[PDB]
Amino acid sequence: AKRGYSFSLTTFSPSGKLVQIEYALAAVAGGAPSVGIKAANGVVLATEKKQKSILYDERSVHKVEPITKHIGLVYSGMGPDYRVLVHRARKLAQQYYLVYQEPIPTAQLVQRVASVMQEYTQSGGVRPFGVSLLICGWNEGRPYLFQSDPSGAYFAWKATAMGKNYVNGKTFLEKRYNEDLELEDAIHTAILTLKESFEGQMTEDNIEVGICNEAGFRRLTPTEVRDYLA
Amino acid sequence: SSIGTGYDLSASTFSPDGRVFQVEYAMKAVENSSTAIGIRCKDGVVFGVEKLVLSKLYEEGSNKRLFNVDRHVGMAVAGLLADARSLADIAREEASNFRSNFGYNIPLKHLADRVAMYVHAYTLYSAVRPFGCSFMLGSYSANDGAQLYMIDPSGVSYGYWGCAIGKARQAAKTEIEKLQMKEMTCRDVVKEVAKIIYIVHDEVKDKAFELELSWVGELTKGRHEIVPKDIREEAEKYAKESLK
Amino acid sequence: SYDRAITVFSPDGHLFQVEYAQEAVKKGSTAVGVRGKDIVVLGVEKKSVAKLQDERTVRKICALDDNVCMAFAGLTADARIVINRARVECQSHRLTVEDPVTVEYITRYIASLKQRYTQSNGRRPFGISALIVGFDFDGTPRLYQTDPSGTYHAWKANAIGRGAKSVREFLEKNYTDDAIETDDLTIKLVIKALLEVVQSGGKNIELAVMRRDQPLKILNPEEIEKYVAEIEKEKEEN
Amino acid sequence: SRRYDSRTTIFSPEGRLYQVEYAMEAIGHAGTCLGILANDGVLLAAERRNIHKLLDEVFFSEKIYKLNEDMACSVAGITSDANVLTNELRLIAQRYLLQYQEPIPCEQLVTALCDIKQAYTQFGGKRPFGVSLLYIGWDKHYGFQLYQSDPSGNYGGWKATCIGNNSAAAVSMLKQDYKEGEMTLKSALALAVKVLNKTMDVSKLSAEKVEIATLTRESGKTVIRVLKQKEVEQLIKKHEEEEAKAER
Amino acid sequence: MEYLIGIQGPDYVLVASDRVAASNIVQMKDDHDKMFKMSEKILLLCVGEAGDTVQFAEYIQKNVQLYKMRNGYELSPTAAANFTRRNLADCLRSRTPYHVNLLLAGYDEHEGPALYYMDYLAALAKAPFAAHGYGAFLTLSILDRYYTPTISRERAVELLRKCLEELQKRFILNLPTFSVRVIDKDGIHNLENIAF
Amino acid sequence: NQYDNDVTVWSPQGRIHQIEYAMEAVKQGSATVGLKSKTHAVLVALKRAQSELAAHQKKILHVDNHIGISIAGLTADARLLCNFMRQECLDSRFVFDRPLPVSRLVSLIGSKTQIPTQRYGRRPYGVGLLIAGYDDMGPHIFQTCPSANYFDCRAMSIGARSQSARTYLERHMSEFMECNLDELVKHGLRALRETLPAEQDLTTKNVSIGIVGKDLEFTIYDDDDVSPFLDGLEERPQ
Amino acid sequence: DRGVNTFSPEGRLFQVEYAIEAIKLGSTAIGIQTSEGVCLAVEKRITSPLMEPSSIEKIVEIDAHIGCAMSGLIADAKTLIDKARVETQNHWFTYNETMTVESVTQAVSNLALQFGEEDADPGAMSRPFGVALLFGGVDEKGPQLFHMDPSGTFVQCDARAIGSASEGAQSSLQEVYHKSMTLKEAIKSSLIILKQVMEEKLNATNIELATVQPGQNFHMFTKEELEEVIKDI
Amino acid sequence: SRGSSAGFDRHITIFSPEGRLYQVEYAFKAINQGGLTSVAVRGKDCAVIVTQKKVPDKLLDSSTVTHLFKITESIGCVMTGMTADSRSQVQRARYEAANWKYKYGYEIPVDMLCKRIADISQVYTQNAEMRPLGCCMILIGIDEEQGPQVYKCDPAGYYCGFKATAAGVKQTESTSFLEKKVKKKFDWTFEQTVETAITCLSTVLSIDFKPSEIEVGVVTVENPKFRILTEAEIDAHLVALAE
Ligand SMILES: [Cl-]
Ligand SMILES: [Cl-]
Ligand SMILES: [Cl-]
Ligand SMILES: [Cl-]
Ligand SMILES: [Cl-]
Ligand SMILES: [Cl-]
Ligand SMILES: [Cl-]
Ligand SMILES: [Cl-]
Ligand SMILES: [Cl-]
Ligand SMILES: [Cl-]
Ligand SMILES: [Cl-]
Ligand SMILES: [Cl-]
Ligand SMILES: [Cl-]
Ligand SMILES: [Cl-]
Ligand SMILES: [Cl-]
Ligand SMILES: [Cl-]
Ligand SMILES: [K+]
Ligand SMILES: [K+]
């Protein structure tokens, strides 16, 4: 028999800093790198899926996930925590669809998912999520890219990177990214930002990439990733 | 062998070397208790327990460490007796629930499996402490044969031919290995069970003792009951005289 | 739900959490009430408003019912909870029973509320003391005061907050029938005892008066400054 | 269990609440946020803390929230806690509307959220919301109004105030400049840019770094607008042109 | 079965209610008041089920009062009427509903004189004039006939007189006395009770 | 010590200190003696006064017509356990119309007393009981402790200086089975006497007796009703 | 740091022992059980001549035949007193009779150690009551006086004192008590002992005096009547 | 600054300054406290489970000492770590599998069972009141659509599919062994996979064991029924290694 703790595990330090959120930020800043780029006619999301052994089945688990027909996800941080947020995101997307009969605006999903993240910075007996989310979407004929993080704060991006070498990946994008890309160009500059932080040789098995357009959201097949890897 | 201050207060906290000390300290409580024994024979299972006389003011038969959990199932306990009784009550309810749901006597292995789940549940949380005892479960039928199981504070359960728990679990096991129990009748096993308790007993540290004995085999028609005053005293005499 | 005992006894037999709440009231703004013959008057101070701030909002005189009003000292955010709980209770006593609340009853409720917060799981005590002013239906004037512990007593005159020890001692020296004779001099008695401790200036003084049968009156910074003139004309001279 | 309890809703020996005052520190490190009350309106002006060449600018605002037909607020502190409170502010506003069929008076809406924030300091053993809020609005009782909200759950009505970074410097700057009863919205807009420029960190000021929202009463309707980039540009440059006329 | 009536003019509201407290076949009271003071300028006239009327009316009365204490100003006649409408409508699809028919008269400093009619179903309607009870069937036509939106108080009391005389002549029930009060700029004024 | 603030914390030695600390509360209470013959079960307890002006504490309590108890330790924990025992005996008579066998009632205490020793935030029962009853199996003397453990005994003593009484009974335990009731009570009194210091002996004010058996229901003799037993006394020797 | 239901190595609950200590800071109260009635007396402890005299109530009425003297944390006591008053009227409703002084005291004693943190209600007690109580009255067993403290333990007393000066007043009663004392001597003794152990002089407005005797009900003494018993110093 | 700590981050599942969960990391060390090593390998036509069966004495009923468990007709698992912790996870897995079929009407896929156990394991990682399970579940079975499957879940909540995998004390040495056997492409038959698994455990521990000393559970395309091999059948594959 059990009954949980009712007190917050995230409190204010004398400096005015919620240390557990910043400590959760450290968990994502140390995870595998991930990049998202808004590209005028679509969005691209790519991640390092280096399992660091040939024994793994590269096809079994995925890091780039669909939330609905028009929304996708990537993360940097803890895999298990991310899974919780994916499941919650998918349910929120359906809850919205059932009520309004209209694909959830990406902005509205992110707000709803970010609120779930906020809960774990104030609720009792729990630690915050050690994941930052990168959420892409297409609604009203416009591409969207959003970032959610352990704080429960959310941001809108033209392009960004997170995880290992997120600082170097960001400056690279500042110089490299220009507005009004075509989507197929964005996959290149996404894989290029990923190459900056890699360490090893890139095969279609080592990285995972998803795309979002007017036709919806899908993850690229291993054969498609190979064709961009040249 | 132990960890101070932090990692040994709660059962919801792992120690740096991957250990739950709260379970291990509860396992220490049983190691301090007097020895309980039980060995599987050809046609049943016998139990033997040394019961240390704290005061001569207590009744002969007080602090029974041999229980009837179900008509065909007997329990032998060692450790914090207060916990041992609650687990005896939990085990009773489980055997009762099984008949209510399925219509026949609980298979012993399953009874052990079920009670073990309940024990284990008290090893995961800060809200509760682990059970400070270890117990054996014995039964007999013509279908399943003679069966003997033992559960400890972690929630682990295994089958046995011979088993012992408490102070001198080691002194008992080496004496049990000597027996060809796979061929022995349960009338014979009682005599040997009685002498092993006497050998195991420390008559120079502990003051004195009583011997508790249980049945569960063909001679009892499959029902678990106490060994008669007559048969016990023959086995007690056997124990005292082959002690030389 | 949060089930931790917040307020517990110390080895010396002290309720530290309740005592800390009394430190909060001692840090509070000066509040003084005095019972007259025909009227009762409250006065509240240590206002120190930035004069960039609209002061209609930060008023420490509150009316609980038609015939009951109160002043507080300490954590002003805590006070608002107590005040509105007392306002709800004022309307419930009117629903369960025909009669309006007696001053002693509302004081007893506020006191029972504060007491409950010293012995209940999960919560800290309130950080306010109250001065409750009202009239009986028979017309006899009543003044009461409460504190974080949950105790309440009736007073002829009293002060709570910072400079309470100083103003209280003044009232003991200055509370006779010569001062209570008129309605004006009792109001003056408040202002004098008030201006005795505050960083001087009638501009920092908000005080309320209520007559036996009249609705509560909050005074014009005109009316009070007129009385601050009758003190300075009779200070250099007297 | 009690070994892990931080005891958030507890009294300190001095008679003060630690978590509340520690939350106050969080506000100081957040963006500078000012509100000024005028005769024919009221405005919010706040420092944008989300600035980057790579940010997308999807929403109308970063720190300004519309809560009501006749009310808007601005925020300083942890933005997630801010989102929780502003959504709740929008709810309380609608509940009042549903019940009485007229908009919630300004002070009342503020009071309601303050009661929730105060409850978080007394019971429940939770951390308080690390947010200070500036409310601006119009009701039929007190006209144009400005309010300040503390994480303590304490509130006050102001003619001019500021919260966040270099807050104390910004208010004493306003204390000298603010002309009581004589302030027009044009005067208050100019003062906002003046106070911000001295108070802000990066020094020159920019239309990407500041956010300004005006609340006016036009044609029997309360009009709320978040100022366009072309408008902020002219507001900064009119102060810049006056900074060049200050020498001889 | 009781009677309520309201007449709204250009700058005033005239209200009247019968003074009978009836049980089965007997008149228990000759001088019962069916008006409730909510504010200085809001009256709530209630009618219907015996135990339900006073309990409901006072609950609303005490909450309008609570609002005044909590805010230092009173509810507008509209806000009041809409509050009482919400409270009745929420009890409609419940295990215990209130069978009360009510009339809210009030004066707003901005909007002016107001008269609100409410069902036991909790449908709210603003009217220049209205009446509750079976008497309405006999009086609403008289009101329809002689009402102009610019009616003076002298003429309005005379119009109420014409309506109450009809209740004596044609209505089967015995209602000999009525409470008469006027709401305006200065508040609620008790007027000479009309007896027959 | 840090292994001794909660019942859910095991000591490295394999022990629970909070159970043992509760066991100390029993030893601090005044002595009480239980013994039985083949026909009767007798409780003899020593009443204690904090001052000479205050009366003596109740030591022996009613449970049912066939069951009685003597307490040692905390008063409230004793009263709580007494009410549980009474409720169990009531439910037994309500349902089965026959008195609850002593063995089973004690087993229920053993099960109930165990619960709080295993849950965090809870505590052990600060009382030990001596239970005298009569049923189909004849007279019974039972012993309960803060630890949920319980014992079936021929005779027992618990409380302050109960070791002296324990040794007396241990010598004369073979005597009790053929004892007449009057001889049985004197044995109980003689053991209780051993607990007292040499200066003082059993008085009519400080001795309480409870008796249940084949002849009669459980009865408590206190003051005037007690002197028949005390009179006829072999003198205190050494 | 520990929990509220923690045993000392000695064998006591810390919070209880600390609650006993809180009473040692409370004003002294005396009760005397006379064969012809019970008298209760207490010092008010006026902090200022501005405080209203009859405002402090450390002796209250529970029932027609029962009086209760209180010491320690006054705020804790009045929660317990309302509970005592509720019990008498619940019992009156159910049984159409007045409760015994023992049962009333026993009822209040049931709330004793009903405090805790975990495995408890939302409104369950966090701590004990820093109060001692003297229940004095007349039932069908003559006049009686009972004493109760936060341990829950309650016992009858022929005469008892509790408060700051407890031991001093206890010794003064010890050498001045006959179980045959008259009620005239009973009120006198309490008034004589009260002035000895106090920091302030005995005034007519300084103390509360109460009597419960077989014939007449519980009586709160009026200032004029107090001046007749303070006439015989 | 690797391996820094502050607060109660070593005791409860909250973050360290680095952003780690030490209590989760300690739970992996609890897997080795079992003192046993588990190996699983996948072929084209099968999946094979293998683990050391240590029996301290002949007093133990040898038939009751096992870390091989059946969750479903089609799905089996090998458990590594604390015995009682492992049994709880098995019971919960059976519950989840039977629960799945009641809601959805088809046999639970090996990958889906693993994810479900992982999501539950995640909860012990985020909530402070309970410790993670110091055990390791390697699942096998045949997906009607995607061929043979081998899946592993964590006390961390991590889950993945594998060509081959080890767990426990000699994990790290046996994963390196398996990598060398993977690089070279054999014909992954039933015999090849069984022996690859057996020879892996016989080299890292260096025993050359009796049939009684190990346990083998298999799953095959022709016979998707999860079967534990018993003494006589293991003995055949052991004398087949010595040819
Ligand atoms: Cl808690
Ligand atoms: Cl994962
Ligand atoms: Cl929705
Ligand atoms: Cl996809
Ligand atoms: Cl209400
Ligand atoms: Cl409450
Ligand atoms: Cl004060
Ligand atoms: Cl933030
Ligand atoms: Cl709570
Ligand atoms: Cl209201
Ligand atoms: Cl309907
Ligand atoms: Cl122990
Ligand atoms: Cl006690
Ligand atoms: Cl003892
Ligand atoms: Cl105690
Ligand atoms: Cl005391
Ligand atoms: K209906
Ligand atoms: K405890």
Curated annotation (Swiss-Prot), chain A:
Modification type Phosphoserine: residues: S6, S13, S15
Keywords associated with the record: Acetylation, Cytoplasm, Nucleus, Phosphoprotein, Proteasome
GO aspect biological process, one term: response to virus
Sequence positions bearing N6-acetyllysine: K69, K170
Compartments reported by the entry: Cytoplasm; Nucleus
Gene Ontology CC annotation, any one: nucleoplasm
PTMs per UniProt: Phosphorylated on tyrosine residues; which may be important for nuclear import.
Residues bearing PTM N-acetylalanine: A1
Coiled coil residues, start to end: none
Residue positions where Phosphotyrosine is found in the record: Y5, Y23, Y75, Y120
SMART domains per record: Proteasome_A_N
Tissues expressing this chain: Detected in liver (at protein level).
Stated role: Component of the 20S core proteasome complex involved in the proteolytic degradation of most intracellular proteins. This complex plays numerous essential roles within the cell by associating with different regulatory particles. Associated with two 19S regulatory particles, forms the 26S proteasome and thus participates in the ATP-dependent degradation of ubiquitinated proteins.
Protein name: Proteasome subunit alpha type-2
Naturally occurring in which organism (per UniProt): Mus musculus
UniProtKB/Swiss-Prot annotation, chain D:
Superkingdom: Eukaryota
UniProt-listed Gene3D superfamilies: Glutamine Phosphoribosylpyrophosphate, subunit 1, domain 1
Alphabetic keyword roster: Acetylation, Cytoplasm, Nucleus, Phosphoprotein, Proteasome
Subcellular location: Cytoplasm; Nucleus
Subcellular location, principal: cytoplasm
PROSITE patterns assigned: PROTEASOME_ALPHA_1 (PS00388), PROTEASOME_ALPHA_2 (PS51475)
Residue(s) carrying N6-acetyllysine: K126, K175
SMART domains in alphabetical order: Proteasome_A_N
GO biological process, alphabetically ordered: ubiquitin-dependent protein catabolic process
Expression across tissues: Detected in liver (at protein level).
Coiled coil (UniProt feature): none
GO cellular component: cytosol; nucleoplasm; P-body; proteasome core complex; proteasome core complex, alpha-subunit complex
Subunit annotation: The 26S proteasome consists of a 20S proteasome core and two 19S regulatory subunits. The 20S proteasome core is a barrel-shaped complex made of 28 subunits that are arranged in four stacked rings. The two outer rings are each formed by seven alpha subunits, and the two inner rings are formed by seven beta subunits. The proteolytic activity is exerted by three beta-subunits PSMB5, PSMB6 and PSMB7.
Role according to the record: Component of the 20S core proteasome complex involved in the proteolytic degradation of most intracellular proteins. This complex plays numerous essential roles within the cell by associating with different regulatory particles. Associated with two 19S regulatory particles, forms the 26S proteasome and thus participates in the ATP-dependent degradation of ubiquitinated proteins.
Similarity comment: Belongs to the peptidase T1A family.
Curated annotation (Swiss-Prot), chain F:
Protein name: Proteasome subunit alpha type-1
Molecular functions per Gene Ontology: lipopolysaccharide binding
Entry PTM: C-terminal extension is partially cleaved off by limited proteolysis leading to a conversion of the proteasome from its latent into its active form.
PANTHER family: PROTEASOME SUBUNIT ALPHA/BETA (PTHR11599)
Keywords from the named record: Acetylation, Cytoplasm, Glycoprotein, Immunity, Isopeptide bond, Nucleus, Phosphoprotein, Proteasome, Ubl conjugation
Gene Ontology BP terms: immune system process; negative regulation of inflammatory response to antigenic stimulus; ubiquitin-dependent protein catabolic process
Pfam families reported for this sequence: Proteasome, Proteasome_A_N
Tissue expression notes: Detected in liver (at protein level).
Cellular localisation: Cytoplasm; Nucleus
Modified residues annotated as Phosphoserine in this record: S107, S174
Domain of life according to the entry: Eukaryota
Cited InterPro entries: Ntn_hydrolases_N, Proteasome_alpha, Proteasome_alpha-type, Proteasome_alpha1, Proteasome_asu_N, Proteasome_sua/b
Keyword flag Cell division: no
Quaternary structure annotation from Swiss-Prot or TrEMBL: The 26S proteasome consists of a 20S proteasome core and two 19S regulatory subunits. The 20S proteasome core is a barrel-shaped complex made of 28 subunits that are arranged in four stacked rings. The two outer rings are each formed by seven alpha subunits, and the two inner rings are formed by seven beta subunits. The proteolytic activity is exerted by three beta-subunits PSMB5, PSMB6 and PSMB7. Interacts with NOTCH3. Interacts with ZFAND1.
Organism: Mus musculus (Mouse)
Lineage start: Eukaryota, Metazoa, Chordata, Craniata, Vertebrata
Glycosylation site residues: S107
From Swiss-Prot, chain G:
Tissue expression pattern: Detected in liver (at protein level).
InterPro entries recorded: Ntn_hydrolases_N, Proteasome_alpha, Proteasome_alpha-type, Proteasome_alpha_type_5, Proteasome_asu_N, Proteasome_sua/b
Domain of life per record: Eukaryota
Keyword Membrane applies: no
UniProt-listed PROSITE patterns: PROTEASOME_ALPHA_1, PROTEASOME_ALPHA_2
GO cellular component: cytosol; nucleoplasm; proteasome core complex; proteasome core complex, alpha-subunit complex
Entry-linked Pfam families: Proteasome, Proteasome_A_N
Modified residues (Phosphoserine): S8, S48, S55
A Gene Ontology BP annotation from the UniProt entry: proteasome-mediated ubiquitin-dependent protein catabolic process
Entry keyword set: Acetylation, Cytoplasm, Glycoprotein, Nucleus, Phosphoprotein, Proteasome
SMART domains: Proteasome_A_N (SM00948)
Role of this protein: Component of the 20S core proteasome complex involved in the proteolytic degradation of most intracellular proteins. This complex plays numerous essential roles within the cell by associating with different regulatory particles. Associated with two 19S regulatory particles, forms the 26S proteasome and thus participates in the ATP-dependent degradation of ubiquitinated proteins.
Alphabetical list of PANTHER family matching this protein: PROTEASOME SUBUNIT ALPHA/BETA (PTHR11599)
Protein's name in the database: Proteasome subunit alpha type-5
